[PDB]
Paper text:
The neuraminidase inhibitors (NAIs) oseltamivir and zanamivir are the antiviral agents available in France to treat influenza A or B virus infections. The NA active site includes catalytic residues (R118, D151, R152, R224, E276, R292, R371, and Y406; N2 numbering) that interact directly with the sialic acid substrate and framework residues (E119, R156, W178, S179, D/N198, I222, E227, H274, E277, N294, and E425; N2 numbering) that stabilize the active site. NAs are divided into 3 phylogenic groups: influenza B viruses, group 1 (N1, N4, N5, and N8), and group 2 (N2, N3, N6, N7, and N9) from influenza A viruses. I221 (B NA numbering), I222 (N2 numbering), and I223 (N1 numbering) amino acids are highly conserved framework residues in NAs of influenza viruses.
Residue numbers in the entry:
A (entry chain F), B (entry chain E), C (entry chain G), D (entry chain H): 76 to 465
């Protein structure tokens, strides 16, 4: 009988290793007989019994005749879809949850909560689904472009916390947090501090008390806005990550942003969503981060880690841990998630490896997974193995 | 060990929103690898654990070579099929329930009842299936064309109520209601009042005591016949909806029908099945309706609502809630259904969007879904995104 | 904690009606994207929860490159497959049970028993499978061609009864009966009486005391051999069906066999497996049968019935019930089976509808189902809808 | 509550028979509509409820455009996949467990354990997954090529025993055995005795206290290294099996290795994974093995058996029990596994039948299965039925 889930101590390990590649378009060739879905913004969320691989589809397949428009972000056909992790997301394997061009999902211990935003840009609408039922909505508040995480929300004892943001992509987007219980929004949380631009937060539990998020600023800085949300008081605060190892793309050179922690620096315009995930141990906390190998291009994906300290106040360079995607291969969005073992949580990072060939052809993605696994060093990189010409 | 289901209070909300689109022919192009089934008359029915998406297939897929005859209404190949709502209705995903060119289905809390009418026009036959087992039949009583709802029947305390009808499409069709329990017919019900012509009723619970249906008159009027069925006494009465906002297609201008409520008016010839769903509150009853945007063509679909009053007596215009499907897009049959949240019911309306290219090509449909969901105004419309040329 | 099944009283009804068509080759065209399996000798068996549609595949699909051989009876590639009844039996939907060119299956209330015969003609081997495990075997005793029912075996209190036979197609073929429990052969039953040729028995439960079988004589008579098997004392007895309505194909004109009951007669060479099922009542026993509409060809299928009496002694013509398949459509093997309702058993007859374009193209079959359904008369026939040039 | 599994006494039987063929490429022709996965190194492992069919895929299908490399051993794309035994392993039916170019799997009665080694040749990494969660890793020790069984590991009382090996392919490869419990390596076992080269062990339980393995020597001999592992003491000893029937391929003539039991002999270069499975009886143990028909080539597959005695000491030829695959057909890797019947275990051997047509086209395999079944002699051989040109 189902009880509410809580974050547990992470399971023992000291390094990440290549775990699993989901590359649907390995079967999408004209010579083939398969129907992989055209997608982007994939993420993974796990419940006590099952892991689900989510994505936003353009409601089209490779091969097919609806490639035109699959390079855009929003339209009336896009849908949040999923399969069990390990299954290839095809037309028939997938299930279509709801229309959305921005999404999230999380399992609270008893049931799946699905999140989907669609509607017109100036008045977008977030929709909440608990299992099969549509249960709530939330309205755009800045009337620019209401949007959400493109990664998993976080549930503790029945309460599910979700980042949403609204505002200009090149101007101001003040983010908020929805608290959602059994499909219904029961509280809005307004963060304090450096709030001028926060989008596409990647969140997780530092403990039973605190959720932390590494987010994206699309205008002002190449440093990641770092949220600290206390779930006991339902309050949040945002300051920029102090580490010399700037995680955004585009970014400047490491350390080159001189001055105090809060200094915005150069190359702030533009952005990318970043992997972030906690390794909780008895007396220390590990924070793992991913960023592209290239400073200005969505190419490659490397892994970093730092134990304890305060991300807001520490200049310290993050320890480079290894290359997950070499700079020759595409490396786009990345997200954190946790797999539930018998008595312990297993932190992972998934990486969106987009197949980009311009607007003249199809535009989709593969997903690579790296998980905390044993000891030593990260050993192997990941390729998609897709020839976009076929 | 499940209990019989009963209609519950509706979930909180005050507006409908775009929820989900099932457009299987987005994957029916020649350079694709999918086999979506060719169907029409789709509808949805929900049990306590699952929503099923039903339709009548022509036992043929796109791409395929059996297009010829997919624009006819009846033949020896048509079958009632279903998939789990959210899955694409393909050859492999679908399950074939029974031979039928007219159908319904509903869950009683324990098991599925599947209804499927087939046979020669002059002597058609209704078939009842309970789970896997064929359990009963009902013979033609007017010998013109026995037929049924093309949407979900309704169960309360293990008793399922089903509308059937038989008669000319341009003359008298005096409908009846069957009371079906565990797959077997236990009582016929003969409605009184205005029984000239009643077909393809879209029914639902107004309360524990009353079932209401918004039906179709294909011969005499563009006002929808309105059934009130007392499930405590198993009697039914029918009168025409009095509202100025005529729901049928074709129809004259709104309010144009001079004279009192019972006035049949002009443009009675023809018709279309219309969406109808209840929003049950503690102290009021909300009635949600859909109708085409075009006055004469099966094009577009708009949403409407009025709270309480007597549908038989009120000439009051229905409130316009929004455009679910614009007039640029096809809008055919519509239906009501209810999704089961943990403690309350969620009213929804489905829209059949037919792909009509004429007799020389394939003839099928997509399904769009809107549901009561939060507050405010209906925000976005639905397109199928299908080019029939591919 | 589950329990053995026993035959129950058949459930109310007085006529059969068209239920379900499984016609996978409707989707097997060259311009399609489906993969129906190529099969023959299909049958259906039902346990307490689901029905399974079994067949013998040639391990090849349509469209495909392996049409050569699909009109042959035995080879090293043939397997017994199934799907849940309602599903299209394709490459991906089907499950492969074991190598076999002759088969049977039945559920005892706890688990499925799968029967499969393969091997060389003069030393064939019957193989039994219980759940996932291979459990027993039986050897050729005549060294001509060991073979079995090609339809459901019959289980009572955990004991399952299966007909096998060994011998020449144009000579002696003395069948035996295996009593099987939980995958293992516990007893052999040697039938007394008219035993010179008995094959492809279609069997059902007349009572808790008696199994009856309508079988096929391929060399001596156009009357069908009829088995009476006493499951209480494990003894079997065979005599020819005395009825003027000769059920084999080919056959002489009805009644035209001159002599007493045991009289063999003319046109005894050739034969076909025939449908036969019991309608059990407290009052009386109904016996439904099926035979081709043509006397000399596998064309059409007619439904017949006599209530009570002794088919060993009664020469009276069986009552014609209706045409399940017209003489314009193919009509091959037919089989009996019973779907389990909550309280009652529903008798059905399935009809293999073979697509026969000769040995230069593919060779497979559709399945049509008719079940006892309500009262009145049988109303509609079944067509496959398949054009073999597509 | 689910308890730990232990080996049980074997099911009654005297001989193996052809059970099942899995040949996915029968449906891989260019004029078809299916997508069989391209694989090699298949094996099978069963738990209390289900058997799974594993393999190592090249992440490509037939037909498709990624054949280049499919004859390769290791790359960054290979993955451990599985379907339920009985299902065709296609793109859609299969589940992707983890990246791997060497694998293993087993069920301990509660949960599955999946083994997958990947990484650089020189610093390879073994990965352990328990259900959904990656739980442990193990590093290369000889830094030459860490690798594992490519067949089922073995679980008793929740303790899973698995063979790993590292070192030269033409020199020393000293193996180790891991004790894995609920996904974690709790003990390593260092074997004594003859240990210069042992790889690709096929292991099974000989009792509740002894596991035996028939392994491969790719460098020094054509006799198979034979591991004995005491699971009570957690110690293992390895000596070459002495029988004159050399099970390796390539091999010299039977008996031609002159000398005492421990002598190496000629033609010890090269190797093949070989079949081995126990038949456990009351006061007797059976030992079934398989080896190729050709002495030099990977063609054909014969079955051999011997009861009791010591494989370390006994020189006598194994009793030839029949041809499973004729020398005209491909016979590559073979492996042992056991199916769990209700009260006993059924021994089987699986055979990899590689479709080899060189480096310029696809490279994959079918899986053939023979199991202990009844009495007498092994009756029929297995062909794939695949024409590589189609
Ligand atoms: C966050 O809070 C949750 C809930 O308080 C913590 O999990 C709880 O504490 C321990 C986790 O190790 C569990 O104790 C165990 O009890 C079971 C019997 O239920 C027993 O088998 C074990 O030997 C152990 O004593 C406790 O049950 C568990 N409670 C729930 C409701 O899950 C969690 O550890 C906290 N996370 C932190 C501190 O990072
Ligand atoms: C229509 O009639 C049915 C039949 O009585 C009504 O269903 C009943 O609804 C009540 C509350 O509305 C349920 O009571 C609740 O039971 C749960 C435990 O099951 C308990 O935790 C709650 O505190 C509450 O007492 C009752 O169980 C339920 N019975 C059945 C058989 O469903 C239904 O409410 C009526 N719908 C209307 C009036 O709109
Ligand atoms: C063949 O013999 C078996 C004996 O096992 C008969 O099965 C039995 O059928 C009777 C029919 O009335 C069942 O009685 C019922 O029991 C249920 C218990 O839930 C009760 O609610 C009903 O009111 C009724 O009394 C009986 O349970 C059943 N036995 C078993 C073990 O299931 C079967 O009917 C015989 N076949 C014939 C007569 O054709
Ligand atoms: C090996 O050990 C297992 C575990 O004790 C034995 O399995 C038992 O078998 C008996 C029947 O002989 C059952 O009544 C017990 O319930 C079984 N125990 C468990 C835990 O399943 C097995 O018989 C032993 N002997 C062998 C394999 O020869
Ligand atoms: C709602 C929305 O359109 N989000 C965009 C997002 C956005 O353009 C920027 O972050 C700026 O606000 O970035 C792009 C992107 O890949 O950079 C993906 C997202 N596309 C989708 N989620 N569909
Ligand atoms: C049984 C039957 O053929 N019902 C018809 C329906 C019917 O003609 C009208 O209700 C008037 O009598 O028209 C509609 C329609 O599209 O208008 C299609 C239906 N097609 C199917 N349900 N198959
Ligand atoms: C085991 C076997 O080969 N059975 C044959 C069967 C047989 O040839 C005759 O009955 C004569 O004994 O008839 C033919 C047939 O359709 O007439 C189909 C069967 N084909 C298969 N079951 N494979
Ligand atoms: C890990 C690994 O690559 N194992 C090899 C194996 C190996 O080369 C020899 O056993 C010598 O060490 O050869 C066999 C083989 O087919 O001979 C295939 C294996 N391929 C894979 N398992 N991928
Ligand atoms: C379609 O079927 C009808 C009726 O069977 C037939 O008259 C017509 O010629 C067919 N059309 C084509 C294009 O074959
Ligand atoms: C057809 O099948 C027979 C059966 O063995 C075989 O001899 C023949 O060569 C086959 N022909 C082709 C073209 O495959
Ligand atoms: C296969 O790939 C290799 C590189 O890995 C390349 O050199 C070779 O030409 C390729 N083969 C073909 C036929 O393209
Ligand atoms: Ca930035
Ligand atoms: Ca009208
Ligand atoms: Ca005959
Ligand atoms: Ca060797």
């Amino acid at each position: 009988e189902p009880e509410w889930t809580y974050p547990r101590l992470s399971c023992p390990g000291s390094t990440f290793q290549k775990a699993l590649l989901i590359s649907p378009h390995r079967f999408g060739e004209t010579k083939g007989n398969s129907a992989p879905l055209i997608i982007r913004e994939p993420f993974i969320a796990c419940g006590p019994n099952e892991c689900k691989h989510f994505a936003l589809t353009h409601y089209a397949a490779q091969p097919g005749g609806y490639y035109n428009g699959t390079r855009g972000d929003r339209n009336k056909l896009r849908h949040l879809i999923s399969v069990k992790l390990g299954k290839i997301p095809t037309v028939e394997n997938s299930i279509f949850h709801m229309a959305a061009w921005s999404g999230s999902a999380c399992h609270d211990g008893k049931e799946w909560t699905y999140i989907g935003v669609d509607g017109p840009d100036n008045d977008a609408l977030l929709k909440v689904k608990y299992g099969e039922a549509y249960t709530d909505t939330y309205h755009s508040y800045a009337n620019k472009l209401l949007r959400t995480q493109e990664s998993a929300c976080n549930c503790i004892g029945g309460n599910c916390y979700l980042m949403i943001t609204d505002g200009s992509a090149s101007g101001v987007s003040e983010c908020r947090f929805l608290k959602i219980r059994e499909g219904r929004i029961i509280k809005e949380i307004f963060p304090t501090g450096r709030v001028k631009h926060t989008e596409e937060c990647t969140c997780g539990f530092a403990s039973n008390k605190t959720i932390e998020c590494a987010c994206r600023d699309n205008s002002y800085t190449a440093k990641r806005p770092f949220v600290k949300l206390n779930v006991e008081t339902d309050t949040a605060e945002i300051r920029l990550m102090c580490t010399d190892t700037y995680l955004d793309t585009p970014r400047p050179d490491d350390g080159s942003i001189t001055g105090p922690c809060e200094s915005n620096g150069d190359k702030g315009s533009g952005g990318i969503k970043g992997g972030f995930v906690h390794q909780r141990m008895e007396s220390k906390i590990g924070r793992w981060y991913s960023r592209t190998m290239s400073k200005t291009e969505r190419m490659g994906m490397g892994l970093y880690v730092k134990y304890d300290g305060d991300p807001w106040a520490d200049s310290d360079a993050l320890a480079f841990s290894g290359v997950m995607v070499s700079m020759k291969e595409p490396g786009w969005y990345s997200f954190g998630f946790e797999i539930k073992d018998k008595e312990c949580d297993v932190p992972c990072i998934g990486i969106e490896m987009v197949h980009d060939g311009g607007k003249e052809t199809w535009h989709s993605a593969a997903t690579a997974i790296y998980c905390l696994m044993g000891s030593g060093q990260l050993l192997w990189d990941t390729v998609t193995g897709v020839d976009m010409a076929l």
